[PDB]
Design a protein around this ligand. Structure first.
Ligand SMILES: Nc1nc2c(ncn2[C@@H]2O[C@H](COP(=O)(O)OP(=O)(O)O)[C@@H](O)[C@H]2O)c(=O)[nH]1
Ligand SMILES: [Mn+2]
Ligand SMILES: [Mn+2]
Length: 608
């Protein structure tokens, strides 16, 4: 932290000064990303009562938030473009709410800003965060400057991005302008809940691609406040990617090593809270196999001149869902979060440790709990001890399984792309596409039960094409056409496309597939298919593994038949819904090739 801004280059200084003019902070501080800075930020937050120490561990901290500020708010997230059609497909003719992004005009946006931001930082410091996405480096690392009035956001940005001296030395005219405020100028007129500043009814997370700008107001929660992450690395970047010949995707990246010692890399698009983190740092239940983590959330991908799809992880940390994490489900996450980690909305134990449903950290008898509400909690209570969307925020270099190449500027070559979401019935454990166009169709057709990561009724089955529904930075029809065109790249070594489902439910009423480390059995088959092994049989929906080429050894309770349902009625209904969905939400912006693939599916279904 410093009061000198002189280290900022001209363009960055200009942006900071106009943000200072608008918001009227009490003082202005440049962040340097240092250890001493981190300590001073931690102390200040403990004073404010925002952070609580966790003495059981090494430099770990707990925040509790206002119950209204616990997740992303998709209905208050907008794309600001001169023309609506650049942001979103035609508004649904039946008049329902848009499902592929919310357009806001530049004029509506300017008005919205003038109603929220003037004097919003009164009595608060404005922190200047120069940051880099990817090694700074690299390239193609992309740099940004985030201003914020929240020390919590500063600390989280320091974990999740590179901040900020090697960043300062590279920073020029070329950068994202990220403006954030929790939107609670001092003095307060009404009290905070859990010392957590936020303005729920006034929340606005805006993206202005043509200005290389993000403007976020009223929320301190991760997806709304860590502007390099979803806002920049997905929304702004996907628009940049489309015009520059690359891809910015909601995808984990991992390395798989086979018993033969062969290593391949795979990307996987799952919706939020649908298994990316647990897969990316999985400990395989097949000991002849090895997994390495590259990233758990965002992938930037570009074909090299070898025609290979190269992927980097632009992030520096993990912002992972805590509930469910244990030495059974994710022992690699357990090792990662043991030190230098900020927890949000998890339980506090009387022994100075943390708690959530699933955690199996050895605890003494008579240990008591306080919930994310900050109130005493007991095994048996109506609600969970930890919020369903509670988080850990930990630096990636503390993961014991990081791929030797995880911060390699060149990227890793991708041989498989995997789509998947939560589907309780009908959709098999694993399917391989018949080819590129078909796999793009499968991606577009993705549906997944809503989770606690945003404002949707948990359990509601929702379309989520490419797991990108909340994160499109431009017209989703054009995004599909971009994916189609990508596969037409001359001499491209295309990855194979797959669709998985970890979440089929049995009768009754558990999960059919044990998942977690056992997902290595699926990845093994996928790797086999990459190697070109004759291990698949065709179905109306794509290739599936032959029974006997999918390793179910040591899973006596698990039946192949339940993993691979193939019911005509289900798929007839699915086609009907897809037809309805595309028509309402994509309209004329739906690529012909996607409709052609739907017609292909309906035709294969006719044969059943
Ligand atoms: N049943 C089951 N649950 C899983 C699996 N993988 C992850 N989960 C759970 O789903 C929730 C979200 O997991 P996570 O990997 O963090 O999702 P992400 O946000 O997509 O990275 C957590 O509570 C996990 O325990 C799986 O293979 N099977
Ligand atoms: Mn995500
Ligand atoms: Mn997660």
């Amino acid at each position: 932290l410093s009061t000198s801004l002189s280290a900022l280059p001209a363009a960055a200084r200009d942006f900071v000064e106009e943000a200072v003019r608008l918001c009227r902070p009490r003082e202005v501080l440049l962040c340097d990303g240092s250890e001493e800075e981190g300590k001073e930020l931690l102390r200040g937050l403990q004073d404010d009562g925002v952070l609580h120490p966790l003495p059981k561990y090494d430099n770990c901290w707990l925040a509790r938030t206002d119950p209204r500020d616990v997740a992303r708010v998709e209905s208050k997230t907008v794309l600001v473009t001169p023309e609506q059609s650049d942001a979103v497909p035609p508004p649904p003719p039946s008049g329902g709410p848009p499902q592929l992004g919310n357009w806001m005009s530049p004029n509506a946006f300017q008005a919205a800003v003038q109603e929220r931001f003037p004097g919003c930082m009164a009595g608060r410091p404005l922190y200047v965060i120069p940051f880099s996405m990817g090694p700074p480096t690299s390239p193609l690392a992309k740099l940004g400057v985030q201003v914020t009035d929240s020390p919590y956001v500063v600390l989280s940005m320091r974990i999740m991005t590179r901040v900020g001296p090697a960043v300062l030395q590279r920073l020029d005219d070329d950068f994202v302008r990220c403006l954030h405020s929790v939107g609670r100028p001092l003095p307060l007129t009404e009290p905070l809940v859990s010392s957590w500043p936020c303005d729920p009814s006034r929340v606005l997370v805006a993206h202005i691609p043509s200005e290389r700008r993000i403007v976020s107001f009223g929320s301190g929660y991760g997806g709304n406040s860590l502007l390099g992450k979803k806002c920049f690395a997905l929304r702004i970047a996907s628009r940049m990617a489309q015009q520059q010949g690359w891809l910015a995707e909601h995808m984990l990246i991992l390395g798989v090593t086979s018993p033969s010692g062969e290593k391949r890399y795979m990307a996987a698009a799952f919706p939020s809270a649908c298994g990316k983190t647990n897969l990316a740092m999985m400990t395989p239940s097949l000991p002849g196999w090895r997994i390495h983590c590259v990233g758990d959330d965002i992938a930037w991908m570009k074909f090299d001149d070898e025609g290979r799809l190269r992927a980097i992880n632009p992030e520096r940390g993990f912002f992972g869902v805590a509930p469910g994490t244990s030495s059974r489900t994710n022992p690699n996450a357990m090792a990662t979060i043991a030190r230098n980690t900020i927890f949000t909305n998890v339980g506090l134990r009387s022994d100075g440790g943390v708690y959530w449903d699933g955690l199996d950290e050895p605890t003494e008898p008579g240990v008591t709990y306080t919930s994310w509400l900050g109130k005493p909690w007991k095994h048996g209570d109506p609600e969970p001890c930890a919020h369903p969307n509670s988080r850990f925020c930990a630096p990636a270099d503390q993961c014991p399984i990081m791929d030797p190449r995880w911060d390699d500027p060149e990227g890793v070559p991708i041989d498989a792309i995997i789509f998947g979401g939560r589907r309780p019935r009908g959709v098999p454990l694993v399917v391989e596409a018949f080819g590129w166009r078909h796999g793009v169709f499968m991606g577009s057709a993705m549906r997944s039960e809503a989770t606690a990561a945003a404002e949707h009724k948990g359990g509601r089955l929702m379309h989520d094409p490419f797991a990108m529904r909340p994160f499109f930075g431009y017209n989703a029809g054009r995004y599909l056409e971009h994916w189609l065109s990508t596969g037409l790249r001359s001499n491209a070594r295309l990855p194979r496309l797959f669709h998985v489902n970890w979440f089929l439910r049995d009768n009754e009423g558990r999960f059919v597939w044990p998942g977690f480390g056992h997902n290595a059995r699926v990845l093994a088959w996928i790797f086999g298919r990459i190697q070109g092994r004759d291990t698949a049989r065709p179905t109306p929906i794509g290739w599936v593994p032959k029974e006997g080429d999918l390793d179910l050894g040591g899973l006596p309770g698990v039946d192949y038949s339940q993993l691979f349902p193939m019911e005509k009625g289900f798929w007839e209904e699915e086609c009907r819904q897809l037809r309805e969905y595309y028509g309402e939400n994509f309209g004329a912006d739906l690529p012909r090739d996607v409709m052609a693939e739907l017609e292909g599916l309906e035709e294969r279904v006719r044969k059943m």
